[PDB]
Design a protein around this nucleic acid. Structure first.
Lengths: 298, 169, 158
RNA sequence: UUCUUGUAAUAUCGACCUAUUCUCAAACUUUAAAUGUGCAAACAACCCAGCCUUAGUUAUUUUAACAAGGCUUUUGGGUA
RNA sequence: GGCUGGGGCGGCAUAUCUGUUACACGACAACGCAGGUGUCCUAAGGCGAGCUCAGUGGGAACAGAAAUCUCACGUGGAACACAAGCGUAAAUGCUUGCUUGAUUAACGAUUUCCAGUACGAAUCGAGACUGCGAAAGCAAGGCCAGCGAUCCUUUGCGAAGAA
RNA sequence: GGGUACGACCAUACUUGGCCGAAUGCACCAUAUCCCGUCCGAUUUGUGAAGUUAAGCGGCCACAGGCCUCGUUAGUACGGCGAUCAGUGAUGGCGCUGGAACCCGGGGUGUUGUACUCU
């Protein structure tokens, strides 16, 4: 790169430092700050942050309350629980983001009992419903804040591809209630404002995948490569593009029907096991002797 | 050792300075355009110079950035014009290099007098395997030293392929 | 005589100082209130609204109010032969709870808690010592002082 | 100078680099006084109950939570 | 007129803004020091998103110091309509995108200067109605100067209905 | 205990260089039909499979750098106190009260919540 500056104490002197997740570059506060902030005046009412997360092709969900000394996650689940609910290959796509939202929503709201208040359609057209309180047809309900909340992002690519949209939809329908401006879902034109829920649903029902898991292989098949280079698991663990809707559909239902959490190996992990390959801060008195003997030497 | 540790071209970076603008620049535009079959990016002057007889915001060069197969080709073509012989001086140590050529037809572009010809500036960027860390927002980070390039790697790379000759000693 | 902005500046006061630049923390915002709090006033800068004039940083007053973004503090401002209460319209960001009072009460209850415990709760329970005092002494090696100049050639200015 | 002369060498002294280094500020400044400057130090209090009430909190009170205030015979009940 | 080390003169210390004087609260004079104000700006307003500087290096026809191009640095050292000062960097900047909140109010409540008058100027709610956005949210024309009694004129203020 | 993740705190958390890394995971990494988005799949959108830990990441290391932190300095300086007193004048001056910055030394070098995981 390039340099002629001091970068030392006068530099340090002349350096400010910024927040940890800016040291990290993990999180940009401004919005979290603005999101988090709550009219005090309106109480200490619980302003909940919904943590919204993807790793390098992996979905993560949590229901949170933002808090000092750490925020607090009341509920969470992520893409490998979808296997309990049978969506096992799928996990990046629009469909699999979505799914994840319905579940957690449900389990959390089953947490305040609510199997059913806010437990939405099972259709999944992929349309819109905001909020207001309404009535009482759902159930499993009670007086502790009715369950609406806000999304924690950090990436404004709110495209008509963006499967944040998906999660939301499940999120909400499976229990959540952050409403939104329904403006860039899959199949949704803002422009001359149009929703094709159907295709959004198709996206929620991977049909783009279906086709891409069509297109990729059996066609490409003519030649050995392309066919030999992506979606390996997917047709290695063989589904057919068509099968698709069922599994989702039934998953959705299964999820919504009950979310009740999967285990893990579960007896105590190992602690000594990780620590086993580490180092820690050296010994200075000794280090001085070590360095000292060497400089003495050469 | 290395497991996969590659050296790759990051991208091809052409510029056509047109010290003036308008028609020559548009005319150029078309050339550069077709050559890369892209939307080159226009550069204009950006200050008034007067020494150059140019002002601010002229529209004084197009340049275009190219990724993919096309680049590699283009590389070789331009190197071809330039028959794979280059200045060490042509290189930033930053792991890139450029050269200028007068005249575009030898790139392989079909002549037309309309366009005629231009003298253009060629810029070559090289990269390595796995680079992404330094360009994706959240937890974007500087480059690991044992991935930090320099000029050498590229001269050696050239000699290995495209068969670099570095002039000089 | 001098120029007067109601936000007329200073040398080194308002300026947001030593690595202390930038927005208020979210901790700042997570705070919570009630009224009647005796809270002290400070100036961020941040937004140049809800921001008192000069009087006020380093002063403790009492809140009488909580509004959306902000809180009302009445402060006693000393004019002529008096202090007048002034009720100032800050957004929340420019004020904080002390300890000024906290201790007094804190102690008072804690103590009461103990005083009460001591009678009339179960237990019984030493604290402190008196003040300051006299004493036996068996020292074991006094010195004296001999000051300056001897071996001054080893030391002192040139 | 040796070299044509060198985007030379070699001397050459400068420029420049750098760490060094003197001496300094009302509108310089980390740090930073002393001297000052706000507040706070009681009963109109504390707790305990259990109350009252609220077109307070996109509402679900309700044997929600909190909020909030109002209460509370012989404190109601306790408590200096 | 006044002003004013006499008057005059000049100057404007006369409404004023800034920074400094001025003692680390607060307050403080001089025709002290160093500066400003009478406008400016439909965005230079407002909101999102995006984007990041001042500055340095290395390369890259032409092109050389200075064109662009490009890597690459780089705590703002910039930059932010403007005097000045404050602030400030995934922004406040800057670029783009969209807009009209520079809007409308029972407009109370509020501050500053302070006579605890005033204006001026600010601050905080509530109602609208918009804007913007994913959303929290913001948004009542950067923040601080840039501005005006009585008196007078003038402009704007229900039609529509049900008696 | 690490990981993961959300953090909160916001430098003992920081620049700089080494050395090393099981797991889970992160990560890099392929792709671009769909959607998405870009001169550009670089970003982003969308898909996510082959690779690959080289980088990252992590942890450590370091007469590293930086910080952190204490001591040291120095009751000097510097203030406060005085009717008093010396002083060309500043001053200086006592006793009564307070009280440094730098320096060097010394040491230190992120803390820790929430949810998840990984014997």
């Amino acid at each position: 790169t390039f340099v002629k500056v001091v970068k030392n104490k006068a530099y340090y002197k002349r350096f400010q430092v910024k927040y940890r997740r800016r040291r990290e570059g993990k999180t940009d506060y401004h919005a979290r700050r603005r999101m988090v902030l709550q009219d005090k005046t309106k109480f200490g009412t619980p302003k909940y942050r919904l943590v919204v997360r993807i790793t390098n092709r992996d979905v993560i969900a949590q229901i949170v309350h933002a808090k000092v000394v750490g925020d607090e996650v009341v509920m969470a689940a992520y893409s490998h629980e979808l296997p309990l609910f049978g969506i096992e290959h799928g996990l990046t796509n629009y469909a699999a983001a979505y799914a994840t939202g319905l579940l957690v929503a449900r389990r959390m709201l089953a947490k305040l009992g609510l199997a059913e208040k806010f437990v939405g359609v099972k259709e999944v057209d992929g349309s819109y419903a905001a909020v207001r309180t309404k009535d009482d047809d759902q159930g499993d309900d009670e007086s502790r804040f009715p369950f609406k909340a806000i999304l924690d992002v950090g990436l404004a690519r709110t495209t008509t591809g963006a499967r944040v949209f998906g999660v939301l939809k499940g999120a909400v329908d499976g229990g959540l209630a952050v409403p939104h401006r329904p403006n860039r879902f899959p199949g949704y034109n803002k422009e001359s404002d149009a929703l094709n829920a159907k295709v959004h649903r198709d996206r929620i029902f991977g049909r783009h995948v279906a086709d891409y898991l069509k297109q990729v292989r059996e066609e490409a098949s003519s030649n050995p490569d392309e066919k030999t280079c992506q979606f390996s698991k997917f047709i290695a663990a063989k589904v057919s593009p068509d099968d698709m809707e069922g599994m989702y559909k039934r998953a959705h239902a299964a999820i919504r029907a009950d979310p009740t959490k999967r285990r893990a190996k579960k007896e105590r992990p190992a602690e000594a096991k990780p620590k086993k390959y580490n180092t820690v801060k050296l010994t200075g008195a000794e280090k001085k002797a070590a360095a000292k003997a060497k400089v003495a030497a050469v | 050792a290395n497991p996969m540790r590659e050296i790759v071209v990051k991208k091809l970076c052409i510029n056509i300075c047109v010290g003036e603008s308008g028609d020559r620049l548009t005319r150029a535009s078309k050339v550069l355009e077709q050559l890369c079959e892209q939307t080159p990016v226009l550069s204009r002057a950006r200050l008034t110079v007067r020494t150059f007889g140019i002002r601010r915001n002229e529209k004084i060069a197009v340049h275009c950035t190219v990724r993919g197969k096309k680049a590699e080709e283009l590389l070789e073509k331009g190197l071809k014009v330039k028959e794979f012989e280059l200045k060490s001086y042509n290189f930033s140590d930053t792991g890139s290099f450029g050269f200028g050529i007068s005249e575009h037809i030898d790139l392989g572009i079909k002549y037309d007098p309309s366009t005629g010809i231009y003298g253009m500036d060629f810029y070559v960027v090289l990269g390595r395997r796995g680079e992404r860390v330094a360009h994706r927002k959240r937890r974007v980070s500087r480059v690991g030293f044992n991935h930090r390039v320099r000029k050498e790697e590229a001269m050696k790379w050239f000699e290995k392929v495209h068969d670099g000759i570095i002039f000089q000693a | 005589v001098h120029s007067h902005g109601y936000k007329c500046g200073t040398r080194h006061l308002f300026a947001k100082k030593f690595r202390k630049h930038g927005v208020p923390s979210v901790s700042t915002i997570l705070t919570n209130f009630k009224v009647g709090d005796y809270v002290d006033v400070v100036a961020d800068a941040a937004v140049r609204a809800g921001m008192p004039h000069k009087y006020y940083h380093g002063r403790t007053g009492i809140v009488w109010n909580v509004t959306p973004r902000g809180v009302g503090v009445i402060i006693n401002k000393p004019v002529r032969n008096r202090t007048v209460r002034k009720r100032i319209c800050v957004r929340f960001e420019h004020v904080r709870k002390s300890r000024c009072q906290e201790a007094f009460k804190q102690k008072l209850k804690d103590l009461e808690a103990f005083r009460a415990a001591k009678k009339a709760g179960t237990p019984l329970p030493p604290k402190k010592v008196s003040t300051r005092n006299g004493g036996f002494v068996c020292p074991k090696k006094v010195e004296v002082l001999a000051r300056r100049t001897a071996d001054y050639e080893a030391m002192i200015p040139y």
